[PDB]
């Protein structure tokens, strides 16, 4: 049998040039794509001030406007989903994940415009969702779209142009090329069989888009927490404890996200309008919160820097936690277009900072800096809910630059999954495909 | 399909026992790697307490600084041919194969062989690294335990191996990430699904990294400090630098390959025509290690200096070729040691040069030579051993300049891309192939 192997060995890393030349177009478009989506979404959150400041006299007037605008938009969002692309509603990953296994379809001629404009609503409105996931999916579709415009055929160029368009997205999103790559090979990748995904093509897609992003976003990063202290050997165990904690909580947050989406289905039973209404309703609520304690609403990004600094009091955190634990589900379980990828980071930062704070006064001899654990746990709900430690671990380091906490971040993100395992729990990313792939069939 | 849905609900469920073995693997590799490195330094230490004592009569030195390196190299090659033919080499292509089941993990031989052997070759002062020596020694430490607790099953065999391996690459370059990323970009039997439990690798990696950290704190391997960042308009410059490693990547492959045949003739297969040619190359290195150390040695210690820019444009070129040779001649000779390390030094150098040219060719870009020295530090690593990701992340792991992460990719991609459209192949795999095709027949 050793015959075959030896032959394959001499034929390694030989991917067709045409593919590689498509990868570069995919990657590029995703770029301008991701950029645009983010520019627009900011512009609307912008208008939602040029509305609040104008009526900054009559209070309930605000509260009201800062509810209608968010609701009107969320609705326009949910609407553009149900009546045009049922798929889009959601993180966007489980689908891309499936299309890679050939169980779901890449209806890009729908998904793109839907997810794009849709999200601007929901997102620009100010709900508890990220705009990352929205780009991952939008990415994949941009890939397929080109795979269909140049008809190039073959399981390699189908899976490849997809996986990158996807990866190309996750990169331009968090301006994080590595993670973008490491994602497509720890998570998206059809997990139980060899696949014809050309790493080297992903790379080119990722790069190109990262450039596109960098062209229109230079000088400024997403998270600027500055260089924190390092973590001395004797304080390592403390990050394993913090892991176990995310480990037992990791799957719990999964049941809820899951369950909550059923319980929230009852409210509309499947009616575009019982949904579209419940939409602006949750959305508006968020928009109202975004002006009476913004740390409970919004993407969540902008509070991480603040949390990691330690500026929140022990209490204010706990409040920010729960509130978000809810406002997140309620917004994500609602099947609204947006990602649960981002707001999980914020959740982590928070839960982590707390653990920090406790640690700090519990042993003052370790000379700790709460922040370090805020970064330790920043990608911990990411290695328990979505169970992709490597993609998580590297996504943080990608955008917080504290490689002196790489040992702890692993020792924390390992305990994350380890208990998310010995206590039920599963890839919240995969579980959904399963539900959504089992609800497809068994329905006849 | 129905099957899929079932497998989905069963993801990331690896047997605890394995996971508890991983931790033992990882640990031992740790104390292992440590020891090997402590010892090797100790010998390079003695080779001064010998040079300083005879620092009066010159040719006396040159002589002692040749004998000691030769005596040790020989003790090295000897401990290989007469006891573990396999060990001689980087150590990776074997581990790579064992993962496919074509080669064997004769740990009851390899361990002591490779270990003590290396101390000779390495401690002597030849152009080889002590990293690869730990990758392999890693794998074996894995198996060893896989055999001592008899736990059976394709998963616990591949797993306990891959980590012992990964756990090595980590404690080596105090670089846990790369360690992991290695076992899943290179090592991993490339053309089929495998039962390697990532989560087990992780635990192994960690544990050894700790072991390493316990005995190496306060000091790192490369301290080049934070270099400037790289502005968008100067990106293309790193793609150029890639294409250059891309065409040179495979070339350095033929040679390493070829040179090992041409160096075989010299001994035709004779343990003694080899063992002699050994201390001979080795002694030569030990001599150089005292008349222009930048030509000899592991190579690590000159990267910091190169990246700074302290070498003149010439001195570099000299340090390049000399090493291009002193590297092959030492690695192609089948001696025990790794070509993984000295390729870093080659890159740092070739890169720094490209920096230097760039610097004066466009002063408007306000470039800092160093940044390209890091751009290309892992470029010969993405053309010769063609594992971009493991490379890219291994540098960042030990140079801390994540602001060059975009260039380092755009350089490391150009690397492979031309190492592709111009023949070339995984110098790591090529060898298994040769050695696996030379097996049968």
């Amino acid at each position, epitope marked *: 049998r050793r015959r075959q192997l030896i032959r394959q060995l001499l034929e390694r890393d030989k991917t067709p040039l045409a593919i590689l030349f498509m990868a570069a177009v995919v990657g590029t478009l995703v770029g301008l794509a991701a950029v645009a989506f983010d520019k627009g979404v900011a512009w609307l959150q912008n208008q939602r001030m040029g509305a609040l400041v104008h009526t900054a006299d009559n209070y309930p007037l605000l509260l009201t406007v800062a509810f209608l605008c968010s609701a009107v938009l969320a609705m326009f969002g949910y609407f553009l989903v149900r009546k045009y692309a049922p798929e889009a509603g959601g993180a966007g990953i489980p689908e891309i994940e499936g299309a890679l296994e050939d169980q779901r379809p890449v209806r890009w001629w729908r998904v793109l415009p839907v997810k794009f404009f849709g999200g601007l609503g929901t997102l620009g409105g100010g709900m508890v969702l990220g705009r990352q996931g929205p780009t991952v999916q939008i990415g994949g579709n941009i890939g397929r779209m080109v795979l269909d415009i140049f008809r190039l055929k073959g399981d390699e160029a189908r899976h490849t142009l997809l996986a990158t368009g996807a990866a190309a997205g996750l990169a331009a999103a968090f301006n994080a090329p590595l993670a973008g790559i490491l994602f497509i090979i720890e998570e998206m990748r059809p997990q139980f069989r060899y696949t014809l995904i050309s790493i080297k093509a992903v790379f080119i897609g990722v790069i190109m888009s990262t450039i596109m992003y960098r062209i229109f976003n230079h000088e400024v990063a997403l998270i600027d927490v500055g260089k924190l202290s390092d973590a001395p050997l004797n304080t390592l165990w403390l990050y394993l404890i913090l892991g176990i904690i995310f480990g037992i909580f990791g799957p719990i947050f999964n049941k809820w996200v899951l369950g909550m989406q059923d319980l929230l289905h009852r409210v509309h039973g499947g009616n575009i309008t019982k949904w579209v209404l419940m939409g602006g309703a949750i959305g508006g609520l968020c928009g109202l919160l975004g002006f009476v304690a913004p740390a409970t609403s919004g993407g969540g990004f902008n509070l991480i820097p603040i949390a990691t600094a330690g500026n929140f009091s022990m209490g204010m955190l706990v409040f920010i936690f729960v509130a978000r634990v809810i406002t997140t589900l309620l917004c994500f379980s609602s099947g609204a277009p947006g990602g649960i990828f981002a707001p999980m980071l914020a959740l982590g930062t928070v839960l982590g900072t707390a653990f920090g704070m406790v640690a700090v006064e519990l042993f003052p001899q370790y000379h700790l800096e709460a922040g370090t654990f805020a970064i330790a746990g920043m990608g911990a709900l990411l290695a328990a809910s979505i169970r992709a430690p490597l993609t998580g671990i590297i996504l943080v380091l990608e955008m917080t630059d504290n490689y002196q906490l790489i040992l702890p971040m692993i020792i924390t993100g390992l305990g994350a999954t380890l208990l998310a395992q010995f206590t039920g729990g599963k890839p919240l990313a995969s579980a959904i495909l399963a539900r959504t792939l089992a609800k497809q069939e068994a329905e006849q | 399909r129905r099957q899929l849905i079932r497998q989905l609900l069963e993801r990331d469920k690896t047997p605890l026992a394995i996971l508890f073995m991983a931790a033992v693997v990882g640990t031992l590799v740790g104390l292992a790697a440590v020891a090997f490195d402590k010892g090797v330094a100790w010998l390079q230490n003695q080779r001064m307490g010998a040079l300083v004592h005879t620092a009066d009569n010159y040719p006396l030195l040159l002589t002692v600084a040749f004998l000691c390196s030769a005596v040790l190299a020989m003790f090295g090659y000897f401990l290989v041919r007469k006891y573990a033919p396999e060990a001689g080499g980087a150590g990776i292509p074997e581990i790579e194969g064992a993962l496919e089941d074509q080669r064997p993990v004769r740990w009851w031989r390899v361990l002591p062989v490779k270990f003590f052997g290396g101390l000779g070759t390495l401690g002597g002062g030849m152009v080889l690294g002590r990293q690869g020596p730990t990758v392999q020694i890693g794998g074996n430490i894995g198996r060893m335990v896989l055999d001592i607790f008899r736990l059976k099953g394709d998963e616990a065999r591949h797993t306990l191996l891959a980590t012992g391996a990964a756990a090595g690459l980590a404690a080596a370059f105090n670089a846990p990430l790369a360690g992991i990323l290695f076992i899943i970009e290179e090592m991993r039997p490339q053309f089929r699904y495998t039962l390697i439990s990532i989560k087990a690798v992780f635990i192994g990696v960690i544990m050894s990294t700790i072991m390493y950290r316990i005995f190496n704190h306060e000091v790192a391997l490369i301290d080049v400090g934070k270099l*400037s960042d790289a502005p968008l308009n100067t990106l293309w410059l790193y793609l150029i630098l890639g294409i250059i490693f891309g065409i040179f990547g495979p070339i350095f492959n033929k040679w390493v390959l070829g040179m090992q045949d041409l160096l075989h003739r010299v001994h035709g297969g004779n343990i003694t025509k080899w063992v002699l040619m050994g201390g001979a190359i080795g002694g030569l290195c030990g001599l150089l290690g005292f008349v222009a150390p930048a030509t000899s040695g592991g190579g690590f210690n000159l990267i910091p200096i190169a990246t700074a820019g302290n070498f003149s444009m010439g001195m570099l070129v000299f340090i390049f070729v000399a090493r291009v040779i002193t590297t092959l001649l030492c690695f192609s000779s089948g001696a025990p040691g790794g070509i993984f390390a000295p390729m870093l030094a080659l890159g740092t150098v070739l890169g720094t040069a490209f920096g230097m040219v760039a610097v004066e060719l466009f002063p*408007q870009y306000h470039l*800092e030579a160093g940044t390209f020295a890091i751009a290309g530090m892992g470029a010969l690593l993405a053309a010769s051993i063609r594992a971009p990701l493991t490379g890219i992340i291994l540098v960042l792991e030990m140079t801390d300049n994540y602001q060059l992460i975009l260039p380092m990719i755009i350089t490391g991609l150009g690397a492979t891309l031309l190492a592709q459209f111009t023949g070339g192949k995984p110098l790591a795999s090529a060898i298994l192939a040769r050695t696996l095709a030379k097996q049968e027949a």
Partner: antibody
Amino acid sequence: VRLLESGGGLVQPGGSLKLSCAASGFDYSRYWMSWVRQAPGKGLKWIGEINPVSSTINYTPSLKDKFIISRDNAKDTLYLQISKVRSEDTALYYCARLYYGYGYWYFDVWGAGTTVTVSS
Amino acid sequence: DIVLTQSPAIMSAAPGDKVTMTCSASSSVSYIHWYQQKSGTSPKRWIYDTSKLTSGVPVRFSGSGSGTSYSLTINTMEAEDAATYYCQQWSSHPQTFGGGTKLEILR
């Protein structure tokens, strides 16, 4: 971020004066410091630039050592030595801090000024 | 070295008016810059990379141009715009500044 340069003044032809420029309000390192002078009434003319580690220093097309820019990062101060001065050297001397956008460097934060008058 | 020559050497226009000043390069440039210099003060970085207003520059101002010829504009200039604008390039070493344009207000 203050860029305050002293030193200027009165110097007789064929003389030498060490202009100083003390920085404050930012990290001196990571920064390429330069000088540009404005001749009374006329425009600006770039003199030199000296990278962080001072491992690079360039000047305009001017001979040997008319100019000698240096910097003591230990004192976050930029220096400029003009030797064998002549009337063409009478102008306002600014020390700027250098940065860039897409990469085609600009003079970021120009300091105050200091005047050098060549006369007897 | 590049010879940047700013067109109007001196010009006057009444506030709320649309004013535009040119800056031609002898050869070829890209990503020009602009500095504003009001009497008694060292220059101030106004526009850059051919049209990126600096943090603070009124959105009144706009940059433009390409390769051989660039410009800077003020949609409805205000009186507080009286100053001397200097376009500068460094797309070719050594950098070079323009002759400057002196804006004067008609009131």
